[PDB]
Write a protein that binds this DNA or RNA. Structure first.
Ligand SMILES: [Mg+2]
Ligand SMILES: [Mg+2]
Ligand SMILES: [Mg+2]
Lengths: 51, 199, 109, 56, 236
RNA sequence: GGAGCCUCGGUUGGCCUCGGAUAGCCGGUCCCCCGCGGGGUCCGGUGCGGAGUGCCCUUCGUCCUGGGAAACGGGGCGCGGC
RNA sequence: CCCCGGAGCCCCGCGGACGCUACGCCGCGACGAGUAGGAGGGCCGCUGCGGUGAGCCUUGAAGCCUAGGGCGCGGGCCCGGG
RNA sequence: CCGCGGCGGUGCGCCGCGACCGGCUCCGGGACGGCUGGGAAGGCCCGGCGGGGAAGGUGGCUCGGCCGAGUGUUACAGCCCCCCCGGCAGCAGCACUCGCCGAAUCCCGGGGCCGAGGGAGCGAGACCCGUCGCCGCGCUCUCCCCCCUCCCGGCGCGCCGG
């Protein structure tokens, strides 16, 4: 068998450890969440500067 | 397609190394005004350093032994040769690209000639250090034709002064011509300072 | 109607001091002197172009005396803008300190 | 000492090592840990049944 | 035949879950309580005296070679060129100007039209200015210059596709041996449909490029590297 | 002017002050001295050098016709003299 | 709730390779400096004998030569021309 | 013979492309954790409390046009600086890159290079072939609705019905 390395090959990772699916479903969503909240903070800082 | 360098003001070894690599990469190099090359460390230092080199000779038949070239051009050529693989074919080929002259003769006198600022004395030495002109050194070690080279360079410098004067006068006419014409070149001249010249 | 290839010189093979690995040329590209100014040229096609006694074929042309050895600038080599190349046949040694054309045309521009 | 470098590895370090370069000694044959079936087959008598358990 | 109930988050990772999906598809309430010899398989025909004959479709072969190669191993994720996914450098947007680097139209400038089905670029250096017709090219042998005509509302013909811009001639046998056979034929003739298409596309393009001053001149010119100018340094 | 072996490298040019460096470059001299220039003083400009090699020059499709701005410039390996 | 001379087959216990010169074939790991010295395998090589190739050979054997074509890690070998 | 139909091996010679995997080497984004629950900083300013250099000051002298410049002395604050009390949201290892260590507290996208090396179908009336494990999904055998609209159909480019 060819050893495909898990840390690149998502579906090899899942086959070894299927909980990685969820751990990476979270920490995209969590990061996207936090990016949004940063943009809103920045907008609020811009609004405060304009005021 | 040909580097012409003004050997004046340059450091003997420092210019040589830069010339050597260029010559190895197929660039044809001309070094000119070699007597003006000047070497770090005081004059007496370097005289003794040359006079040692002169002592090195093949005891049994000096006619074979190390050929001590006196001419500054040939000195420079020698030190450049030291930074090539000059026993090989490629090393020899490379040496044959190089061309070196005491003073500045007629093909190169009417050519703008570059300066290696990495080998330049003003840059590379501290101003409180001493150095030797490779003309004097050559003169005192045997070189015959310092005086002749000097006189020819006066004539060359006089002839060059004229050329410069005429170049200046043209540049002056160009500047006046632009002022004469600056309404019928206005919307060309405008675009040549949107894209960032003339400023 | 003009030149569509950047000028470069064939500096010599990839080599330690005393072992030369003839399967990996070194290329000094003109005007580029940093392991920085060289991301442009990575993966670019490059030709050593040299003519010889006997005639050959020529794509889209009548037979000619010119021949080329094709290659490919693989990666940058050491700080001062030198680059490594790899040619479908190794380079002659005759060829040192001569022109090799680096093309533009696996462009990422 | 002068023949080794060593220290206290991270969690990440343990994960990287095992996943990227994890090979099980299986009938004395160095074999890559491509599936749990291998780890379980050898270590399953210890409540170790997947790569994660090995890391743990 | 609904579309995909969870969207894509990353290649291979859905936005939702198992359990979130169970809820959306609704596996609750969608529960499915469900608890040769004589007769010949596939031959059959007619025919006169004696009776009707039983033929055989796909009859066993009349020769076997002395040895033959033995299958392969399936291999998972190799698709044919047709089924591939096609890319494009962001630099190339429709109506941008290119420098076509490779062919006979070498260093000529050009107006990019559309990415074809192949993944080639369709291109026109309006035949009138540049002498470069409606023509395919490759992303890779092309420099995407930062100069864009606004080509938005030109109806490029639907019928002009990858298939049409494709070389035509030459079949197998004929007289063959001697000093003849398809060394002649000689010329790719242009055809009239091709000229009409060029006409139709160029008329729509050309007026837009004449709205940008000097641009027709630029497109007339050819690209080349001169002394003291280095691709890495300059921009396009 | 025609063919025809062979040897190859190349794949825009740069037609020039001198030099200085704890300094330089350009102007203009109203004014003075020397042989259109050279030297001086004085003044006015530049000086991380735009009268910049980080530069300058040159353009890179061919033709047609029918307008504008620019316009006597280019050629005939055009021809004789200084 | 039935029979493979017919389930149509990813498993088939009814019969079994394209494979099986079992001194064969196939799969996984690991490893590979070497004098003196030891051991193994040589479809490496020389000469002669018992067998054997319904072998080859004046329509040209051996030997010799070969900028001819090939094989083998190698000892070597095979083909073409003379 | 024309089909280049389906399968199998191939390419005369030189080439190029594409996507998939393996191994690399780089690039660009973003999201977090900890600390002297970071240190400094910024911004707003207010009330105090001292100390220092040394000043819109004064003074001897000097240099230029009462003013500007240069030294010198005692030193308050009308140039600052420093300590001490008390209090504000703007911080955030901060793109005002001043100084870390990291990642189940971590992810995404992109570029260059080298490589593909194996082959679970040799049945006589029914495949010359899939595919194992993993992801999920996606879909369907459940009904709903909404949108956009590609093909086609209808009506007035617009609207309505795969
Ligand atoms: Mg003598
Ligand atoms: Mg040529
Ligand atoms: Mg051994």
């Amino acid at each position: 068998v060819l050893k495909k390395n898990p840390l690149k090959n998502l579906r090899i990772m899942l086959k070894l450890n299927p909980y990685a699916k969820t751990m990476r479903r979270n920490t995209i969503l969590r990061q996207a969440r936090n990016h949004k909240l940063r943009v809103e903070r920045a907008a609020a800082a811009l609004a405060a500067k304009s005021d | 397609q040909v580097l012409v360098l003004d050997g004046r003001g340059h450091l003997l070894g420092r210019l040589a190394a830069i010339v050597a690599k260029q010559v190895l990469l197929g660039r044809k190099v001309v070094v000119v005004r070699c007597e003006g090359i000047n070497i770090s460390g005081n004059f007496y230092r370097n005289k003794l350093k040359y006079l040692a080199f002169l002592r090195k000779r093949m005891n049994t038949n000096p006619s074979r032994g190390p050929y001590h070239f006196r001419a500054p051009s040939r000195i420079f050529w020698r030190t450049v040769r030291g930074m090539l693989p000059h026993k090989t074919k490629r090393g020899q080929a490379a040496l044959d690209r190089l061309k070196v002259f005491d003073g500045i003769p007629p093909p190169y006198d009417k050519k703008k000639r570059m300066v290696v600022p990495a080998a330049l004395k003003v840059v590379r030495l501290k101003p409180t250090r001493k150095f030797a002109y490779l003309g004097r050194l050559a003169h005192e070690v045997g070189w015959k034709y310092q005086a002749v080279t000097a006189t020819l360079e006066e004539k060359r410098k006089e002839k060059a002064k004229i050329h410069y004067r005429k170049k200046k006068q043209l540049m002056r006419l160009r500047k006046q011509a632009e002022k004469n014409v600056e309404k019928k070149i206005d919307r060309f001249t405008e675009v040549l300072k949107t894209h960032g010249f003339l400023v | 109607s003009g030149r569509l290839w950047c000028k470069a010189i064939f500096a010599g093979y990839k080599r330690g001091l005393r072992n030369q690995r003839e399967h990996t040329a070194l290329l000094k590209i003109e005007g580029v002197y940093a392991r920085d100014e060289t991301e442009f040229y990575l993966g670019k096609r490059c030709a050593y172009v040299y003519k010889a006694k006997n005639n050959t074929v020529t794509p889209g042309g009548k037979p000619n005396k010119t021949r080329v050895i094709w290659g490919k600038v693989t990666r940058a080599h050491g700080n001062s803008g030198m680059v490594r190349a790899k040619f479908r046949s190794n380079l002659p040694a005759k060829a040192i300190g001569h022109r090799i054309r680096v093309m533009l045309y696996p462009s990422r521009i | 000492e002068p023949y080794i470098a060593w220290g206290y590895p991270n969690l990440k370090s343990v994960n990287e090592l095992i996943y990227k370069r994890g090979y099980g000694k299986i009938n004395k044959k160095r074999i890559a840990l491509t599936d749990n079936a291998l780890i379980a087959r050898s270590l399953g008598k210890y409540g170790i049944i997947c790569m994660e358990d090995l890391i743990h | 035949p609904h579309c995909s109930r969870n969207p894509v988050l990353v290649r291979g990772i859905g936005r939702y879950s198992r359990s979130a999906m169970y809820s959306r598809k609704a596996l609750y309430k969608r529960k499915y309580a469900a608890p040769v010899l004589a007769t010949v398989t596939k031959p059959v025909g007619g025919d006169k005296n004696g009776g009707t004959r039983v033929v055989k479709l796909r009859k066993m072969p009349r020769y076997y070679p002395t040895e033959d190669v033995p299958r392969k191993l399936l291999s998972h994720g190799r698709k044919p060129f047709s089924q591939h996914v096609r890319k494009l450098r962001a630099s190339i947007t429709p109506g941008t100007i290119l420098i076509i680097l490779t062919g006979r139209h070498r260093g000529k400038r050009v107006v990019f039209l559309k990415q074809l089905s192949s993944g080639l670029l369709l291109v026109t250096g309006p035949l009138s200015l540049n002498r470069v017709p409606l023509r395919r090219t490759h992303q890779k042998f092309v420099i995407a210059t930062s100069t864009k005509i606004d080509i938005s509302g030109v109806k490029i013909p639907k019928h002009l596709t990858d298939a049409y811009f494709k070389k035509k001639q030459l079949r197998k046998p004929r007289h063959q041996e001697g000093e003849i056979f398809d060394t002649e034929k000689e010329k790719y003739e242009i055809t009239e449909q091709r000229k009409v298409d060029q006409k139709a596309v160029d008329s729509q393009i050309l007026p837009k490029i004449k709205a940008v001053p000097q641009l027709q001149g630029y497109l007339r010119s050819v690209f080349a590297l001169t002394n003291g100018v280095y691709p890495h340094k300059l921009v396009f």
